[PDB]
């Protein structure tokens, strides 16, 4: 699974003393985060599960 | 390949273990985040 966003952390000193980490800017490969699954592997294992069922 | 793409969403305000009455703010993690893991079982309902 991947989140292709080289984003920054514009931390803001909303004290007193204590600090808050806000979201800076979002740059890079602006794509939606997603997961990669080996399809044949899933199909194969799922089948093995169905056998039990 | 073949392979499957699963659309995901990101949240920063979350509630643990179905517990209401409090919430936790995740700080944004700087830079590109990517990881890999082993799926070792299913939680299924009939």
């Amino acid at each position, epitope marked *: 699974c*991947t989140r292709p966003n*080289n984003n920054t952390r514009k931390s803001i000193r909303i004290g007193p003393g204590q600090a808050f980490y806000a979201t800076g800017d979002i*740059i*890079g*490969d*602006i794509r939606q985060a997603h997961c990669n699954v080996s399809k044949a592997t899933w199909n194969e294992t799922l089948g093995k599960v169905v056998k039990q069922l | 390949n073949d392979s499957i793409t699963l659309p995901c969403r990101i949240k920063q305000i979350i509630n643990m273990w179905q517990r209401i009455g409090q919430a936790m703010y995740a700080p944004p993690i700087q830079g*590109v985040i*990517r990881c890999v893991s082993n799926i070792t079982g299913l939680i299924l309902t009939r």
Partner: antibody
Amino acid sequence: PQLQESGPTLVEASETLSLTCAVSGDSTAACNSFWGWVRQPPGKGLEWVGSLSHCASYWNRGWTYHNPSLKSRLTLALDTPKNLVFLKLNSVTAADTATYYCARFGGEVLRYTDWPKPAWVDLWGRGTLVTV
Amino acid sequence: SALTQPPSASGSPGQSITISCTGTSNNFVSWYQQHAGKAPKLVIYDVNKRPSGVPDRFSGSKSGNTASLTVSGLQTDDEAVYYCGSLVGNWDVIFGGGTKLTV
């Protein structure tokens, strides 16, 4: 924002050419642009040499874009604490005589889809004529 | 694949010239201005966009396989060699032959 070409003006046939651009007024290490070169032959038009950036993604250690006809003899480099751009052109022939320009590249760089797409010379140098 | 520009342009001051660039696009289209003994200057990018300082009388467009740049209200300083530019395939930066314009 000021670019400045520097290096030898005369090299020997088959010798590697090493040119350096002095960048002032901005930081080359910043994700806003690509850095590279263009070499206009005397009495002819512009020719893109190449460009690169150290603004890395999870799967690499930055981005490098070569001219497919020149790749076979070309290495590029950057110096982020001094803000310098380097041209390492291998085995230089008479056909390689040209006016070389320090180029900052604008385009769909900073925010991009699938891979960075720079498309224009954001900032120009003045040019230097290198011969053999 | 490459960009094509006719070798040269002409009209009197106060006139307007539209110059073509054949080799299609893409929104990744730009034009440059070069004077003799001078480095090229970026005139326009993203077809329609002028960077800070470029006069309001400079403007291009595109259709099909050809892009264009129109320079209106010609004067002495407008005489220069102009180049169009296009991003091709993956990252290939192409320059046209160049069109030398005279007022």
